[PDB]
Design a protein around this ligand. Sequence first.
Ligand SMILES: CO[C@H]1/C=C/O[C@@]2(C)Oc3c(C)c(O)c4c(O)c(c(C=O)c(O)c4c3C2=O)NC(=O)/C(C)=C\C=C\[C@H](C)[C@H](O)[C@@H](C)[C@@H](O)[C@@H](C)[C@H](OC(C)=O)[C@@H]1C
Ligand SMILES: CO[C@H]1/C=C/O[C@@]2(C)Oc3c(C)c(O)c4c(O)c(c(C=O)c(O)c4c3C2=O)NC(=O)/C(C)=C\C=C\[C@H](C)[C@H](O)[C@@H](C)[C@@H](O)[C@@H](C)[C@H](OC(C)=O)[C@@H]1C
Ligand SMILES: CCCCCCCCCCCCO[C@@H]1O[C@H](CO)[C@@H](O[C@H]2O[C@H](CO)[C@@H](O)[C@H](O)[C@H]2O)[C@H](O)[C@H]1O
Ligand SMILES: CCCCCCCCCCCCO[C@@H]1O[C@H](CO)[C@@H](O[C@H]2O[C@H](CO)[C@@H](O)[C@H](O)[C@H]2O)[C@H](O)[C@H]1O
Ligand SMILES: CCCCCCCCCCCCO[C@@H]1O[C@H](CO)[C@@H](O[C@H]2O[C@H](CO)[C@@H](O)[C@H](O)[C@H]2O)[C@H](O)[C@H]1O
Ligand SMILES: CCCCCCCCCC[N+](C)(C)[O-]
Ligand SMILES: CCCCCCCCCCCC
Ligand SMILES: CCCCCCCCCCCC
Lengths: 1034, 96, 96, 240
Amino acid sequence: MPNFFIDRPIFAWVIAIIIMLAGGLAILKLPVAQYPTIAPPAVTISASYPGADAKTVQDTVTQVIEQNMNGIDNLMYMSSNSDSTGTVQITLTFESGTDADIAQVQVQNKLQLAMPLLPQEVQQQGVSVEKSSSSFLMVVGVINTDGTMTQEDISDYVAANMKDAISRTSGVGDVQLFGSQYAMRIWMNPNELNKFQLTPVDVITAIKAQNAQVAAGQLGGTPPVKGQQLNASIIAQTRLTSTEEFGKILLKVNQDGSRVLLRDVAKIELGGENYDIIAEFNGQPASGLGIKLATGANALDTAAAIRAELAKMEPFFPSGLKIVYPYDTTPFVKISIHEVVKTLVEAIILVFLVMYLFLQNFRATLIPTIAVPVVLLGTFAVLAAFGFSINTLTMFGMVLAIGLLVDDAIVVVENVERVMAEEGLPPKEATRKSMGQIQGALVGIAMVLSAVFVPMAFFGGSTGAIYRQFSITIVSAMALSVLVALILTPALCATMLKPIAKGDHGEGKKGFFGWFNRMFEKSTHHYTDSVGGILRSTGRYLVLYLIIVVGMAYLFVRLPSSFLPDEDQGVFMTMVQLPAGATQERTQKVLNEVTHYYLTKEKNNVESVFAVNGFGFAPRPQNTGIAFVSLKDWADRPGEENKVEAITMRATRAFSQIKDAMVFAFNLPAIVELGTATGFDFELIDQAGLGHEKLTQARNQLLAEAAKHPDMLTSVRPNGLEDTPQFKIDIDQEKAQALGVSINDINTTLGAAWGGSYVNDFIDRGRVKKVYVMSEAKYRMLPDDIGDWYVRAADGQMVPFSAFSSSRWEYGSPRLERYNGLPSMEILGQAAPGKSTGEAMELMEQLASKLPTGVGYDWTGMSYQERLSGNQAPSLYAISLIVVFLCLAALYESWSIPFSVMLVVPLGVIGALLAATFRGLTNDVYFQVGLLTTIGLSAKNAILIVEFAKDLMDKEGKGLIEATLDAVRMRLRPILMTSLAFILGVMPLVISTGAGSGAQNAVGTGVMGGMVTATVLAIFFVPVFFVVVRRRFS
Amino acid sequence: DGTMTQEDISDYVAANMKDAISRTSGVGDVQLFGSQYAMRIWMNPNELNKFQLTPVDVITAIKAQNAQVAAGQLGGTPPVKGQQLNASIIAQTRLT
Amino acid sequence: PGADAKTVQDTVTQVIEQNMNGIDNLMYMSSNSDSTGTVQITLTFESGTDADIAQVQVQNKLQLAMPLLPQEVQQQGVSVEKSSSSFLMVVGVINT
Amino acid sequence: LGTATGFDFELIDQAGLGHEKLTQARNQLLAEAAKHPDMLTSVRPNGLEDTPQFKIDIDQEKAQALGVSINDINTTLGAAWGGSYVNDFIDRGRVKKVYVMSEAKYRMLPDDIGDWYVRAADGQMVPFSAFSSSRWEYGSPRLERYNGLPSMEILGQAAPGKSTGEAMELMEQLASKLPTGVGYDWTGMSYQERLSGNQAPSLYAISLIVVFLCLAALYESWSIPFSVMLVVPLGVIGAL
Ligand SMILES: CO[C@H]1/C=C/O[C@@]2(C)Oc3c(C)c(O)c4c(O)c(c(C=O)c(O)c4c3C2=O)NC(=O)/C(C)=C\C=C\[C@H](C)[C@H](O)[C@@H](C)[C@@H](O)[C@@H](C)[C@H](OC(C)=O)[C@@H]1C
Ligand SMILES: CO[C@H]1/C=C/O[C@@]2(C)Oc3c(C)c(O)c4c(O)c(c(C=O)c(O)c4c3C2=O)NC(=O)/C(C)=C\C=C\[C@H](C)[C@H](O)[C@@H](C)[C@@H](O)[C@@H](C)[C@H](OC(C)=O)[C@@H]1C
Ligand SMILES: CCCCCCCCCCCCO[C@@H]1O[C@H](CO)[C@@H](O[C@H]2O[C@H](CO)[C@@H](O)[C@H](O)[C@H]2O)[C@H](O)[C@H]1O
Ligand SMILES: CCCCCCCCCCCCO[C@@H]1O[C@H](CO)[C@@H](O[C@H]2O[C@H](CO)[C@@H](O)[C@H](O)[C@H]2O)[C@H](O)[C@H]1O
Ligand SMILES: CCCCCCCCCCCCO[C@@H]1O[C@H](CO)[C@@H](O[C@H]2O[C@H](CO)[C@@H](O)[C@H](O)[C@H]2O)[C@H](O)[C@H]1O
Ligand SMILES: CCCCCCCCCC[N+](C)(C)[O-]
Ligand SMILES: CCCCCCCCCCCC
Ligand SMILES: CCCCCCCCCCCC
């Protein structure tokens, strides 16, 4: 194949171009992400029971729905929450690989059996089934710069003109309105209602009757009479459109003939469906859309489509209304990937310079510099075929690949330039001879190297999909690299390499190059003279090698391990959690303090703050709040102290002062669904119908016991709310029966007044919206206001609530949790410093075993994936070692000689561990995959040295020591050519600061440190390994 | 130990075992060989006839007196600003 | 039955349209509401979209919008079918 | 497919202006389009015009004063005049619908409205004429919506010797001079022609580049391929 393309350079060029077109066309069409989607699919059922307490919701909705959730494929677990706001949220989590489309269809197929058993009020609020991520992709804030519109006016506009179109955009799994759409608010007055002897029941009946859309048929409608000439639609009652129209709804005509209108017994205004969520952007009033990414959907592509839909709306905004972007997770992905693309382009340039230093011919320098772009672009085409995406790991696979790509090129170019220098053949014949003697080793090496990376594509579950990206990328690159090294690189050598005279090693060149050539030829002569002496010792360096393996073993064992570094993403969140029973006003006091801190203290770092009252992870009215903090560009805030980790740790420390409120600023982890580094997610189960009060006691007992082990467990706390005072009112059925008052009228009057009642729909400026009846605030604030509410008996007399009701204060849950259909209580916590999660969970199980009768436990979220198959690194690298040995045994046709290559592994590991240890890095994904790359090159170096030596001993019949010296003499220039080119190519990564520098620093440090030790040691030790091994086995 | 009848076993299976098994991996349809407990009101027509009542009166009463009412909140949104108390109103719960 | 364009639009078309969220690969959506007492909402999807998945996601979002439609419309039923103007043939049945 | 020159335009109410103001905005666009016969042909709405409809107002006060329930009134009207699907029945083993409606001769003209009586609480039969007033108004017998918002579909095509892309560009220009809140969008063939027309250049290019490169490999020269590639017009001329 080399011989063919040496005679056909234009053919070789055509293949390279087609590969680059395929690669180029792939880059335009390939999806872009931060990581591959490893998170398990989650379908969330959300229903709303207006005016319902936590238990009413649980025992009429949650349980009824949960009991129908059965025969659902690939279901891991099912958590549910039933809170005092009237909300239920059942999350069904599915196995990794589950089709989210089918999971939704199945979950919804079962919910459809439960729907008819649910209350009519819960049905009419719409039960939603959604397949989205639990955290926000972005937040689209909307403000008024002219201050022409209030917080409510903006919220209604966003809901009525923007919300729906965004919800229908592909990849948008869920959209949360930070505010409420307007409804027709009928604020009932009990003084006026009783005065005219009317109830909330009469108001609801009147609205339904007089806010009706009546289908009245047609004049001359079919079937018609003969000779009918007129056909016209009959328009009867239509929906009311204004506060005024609702105002003049006739409730009753008094005996004297005077009219009682709805406005005579109620304040009628346009106002939110609910008054629970109130948002502020940089202190001023705002609304917006919390957009959640659909399961398996592309963040960047979806974010783009969202922005495209917002661009359509902007032209038709009212005066002053303006979109702001106070939280976006996509820009980091778009910018952090561009930073890795930049270090790729920089490495290709930094290669060209080191390539020009040695070849010293602009045309010869391009042969390795052309090969790299062709393979990398080629790899993008292979990714596309295999259905992978342009993510951080694939993009870093390309960066680490560059090392393996130039070596293939350098080996081919260097060996041709040598052949010409030793014999004085023309470029075409020198290439033909050169390709003839290394093409076998190149193809063979790629199979030996593939046995290093292929194994880490066979890791299990979520953590395995991460490694499989690097593996397939690097392996695809090597496959193309060898293919390009047999098609193109030979053809380019034959045409572009300058004819070199016999005995011309430069030296005769004038200037810098002249000095360099003489300095290198004496360095080569010194090196060969130096190695000559090393081999006469042998025993000295075998004792020195055993020291390095012990030093390696020591550093590796003490060096801590992680998964993926926490990156500054130019965004973070602050959670505000007050004790349940705390008011909207008290939460806003804390949110103001949080917003104040970021706008005053962190004005240098923080760009914007989007604070939301009555929202957190989900809507949790009154006692809960969240702040979305977007920072300034990474360039505008240099140093560790101005990065998210420092900012949030200062913020948490500052917010610890705040009273009767838990306030935490936290960075979003590398992957949310893997949780913290050493945290656990524990579930306490009621297995014997003990009840909530007994389960609360069982939890308190466990938490108390967990506190008595600070040595093992750190900050073990519940992920729920505590019981609060609740107003228990008993309706005396006998007294109600005696006075002639129906319980329907009683319950409707209480619920409609204090809870609110969704009557029917109306048309607000051409859009269908809700009509809500409810007590005016001032008549539903005090317990004593209960007696102000009158119900009409059958005999016509108005009866106060005080007449047929008794009340008392009691305690109950504002948020009832269930796990796998049983009453539960989520408990979070991490292992104490030094102790592992496995040791911590073991103690939690032990402590949980001592709990009262009927109390079980379980592990969920991150803890579920931990007790699942893990720690399979010894297994897969035991195989890798065995396969690498066998592959070398086939190459050299020897069971013994492979050891001469396999003993160089530690020479590269020691450098990685030293550099990683000294810079305070950890044994993470980026360190491991960068170490495999270093082991790959140092092994590839060792293969060619032993190959040349063995070839001399077999083909030329030269002696062991003479062959070793002659081998290392020819295999020095190409080794140092690769080391410099790769060490200098990953300099940008090591010094890197800005977006995604955490990964770059981690990749670059482990590689640079390794390559340094892997080069200087190998050139002296590979000879010692070959001579020791060949002597030992004869 | 003969402390549970066919009915008692069937309820425990239906109420504590069936649902968790029906959600286990690879499990399709789950048929209960028995019945879960319901609240059984066994009506006597002679006693109903005596007090001039029907199954209609019994149903109407059970729906009225075995109700789970959504009764709203004290100090709920929108509140009168300065409100300190925010408490759920618990009306009728299900009979147990 | 007996509904004007406005009545259909403001009780059926708008309610259904408002609930057509979280459906994958939707390009655009169009609807008619006329005095023949009929509404027809057409959802056109991206080329290569599984029409079965497209249809099931639409009828599922409709199922949860059904309780918000009038009794008269719920009773009649709301059909969700794959759009097609291409017949193999039209068999005419006549009485001579 | 429709027509290749034909476009499919959607005039959109983006600010809750109403049906009537969207009708006026459409009439304005239809008029301006007619003032460019050189570019646009048969610019016409794919919709129905407003028609006379019989607006009847039930007086709530007279109904409540006469003891006539509004429910019985709106049922009597809807059931008689519009028809009402009551429940099902089995005809020869097939479940079929039961419909109550007025016999044609009692639901033809406005004069028939007063012949329909509703029973009051006191059992007296009150005619519709007693508690109702009627007038003529205009309304839509077919209300269109596009992407959730009120719309009006406009059909048309590029005039003789003009491209479909040119006609669209003018329709967009004329649309940018319509009342505040009146937006527009492309649908059907127009939506697809915009997307499928965007990628046409890239394919034509990729085709020529790969053909060239393939001939270059065959002949081992960058020059000779042109000798082959120059043939393209010799076939196209005769076809045309
Ligand atoms: C480790 O996890 C963290 C971040 C996940 O990242 C997110 C994006 O993913 C989350 C998931 C999957 C949840 O389940 C959450 C949750 O249940 C919360 C809160 C909100 O606090 C949350 O905020 C989340 C939450 C996230 O932000 N609890 C509630 O809403 C309710 C009803 C009550 C609150 C109880 C206390 C106050 C809470 O337990 C507190 C003691 C801490 O333990 C948490 C705030 C944790 O903060 C940290 C840094 O210790 C987060 C769960
Ligand atoms: C190129 O297209 C043609 C035929 C397709 O062949 C068929 C088989 O396929 C059709 C399709 C895909 C439609 O969308 C139709 C349509 O929307 C219609 C009418 C019914 O006319 C139709 O009849 C069709 C129709 C066909 O018969 N409009 C309506 O019903 C409504 C609600 C209002 C009508 C408004 C006017 C009156 C109409 O716009 C008129 C001005 C012309 O524009 C059309 C009649 C076009 O004729 C011509 C001559 O240019 C057809 C769209
Ligand atoms: C020699 C070094 C080789 C290494 C090259 C590495 C480059 C990798 C870049 C990946 C990140 C950017 O990937 C980004 O993807 C989007 C996806 O639509 C592309 O978007 C593209 O959309 C359409 C597709 O027909 C094109 O007409 C348009 O010109 C282009 O913008 C961007 O042009 C590209 O910038
Ligand atoms: C299905 C599982 C299979 C997995 C096995 C694959 C891994 C094996 C890797 C070995 C790589 C091949 O290594 C191969 O070794 C032989 C000597 O033994 C070399 O040399 C031999 O073949 C060349 C081919 O032109 C000839 O000159 C001559 O027959 C001999 O010298 C090859 O040039 C080299 O390419
Ligand atoms: C630097 C950290 C520790 C890691 C060490 C690995 C890197 C090695 C760096 C290069 C060392 C080369 O050092 C080399 O040592 C050998 C002996 O061992 C010397 O050789 C000398 O001793 C030998 C042994 O008796 C004699 O046969 C020889 O005639 C004499 O010159 C070489 O003259 C010297 O060049
Ligand atoms: C890094 C540069 C160190 C000295 C370089 C010497 C350059 C001089 C060129 C050769 N000379 C003029 C001495 O013959
Ligand atoms: C990017 C295209 C590179 C073209 C290089 C051409 C050199 C080979 C031609 C040989 C002429 C005899
Ligand atoms: C060389 C590429 C092989 C592809 C690897 C797929 C294996 C998936 C691992 C799942 C195990 C739980």
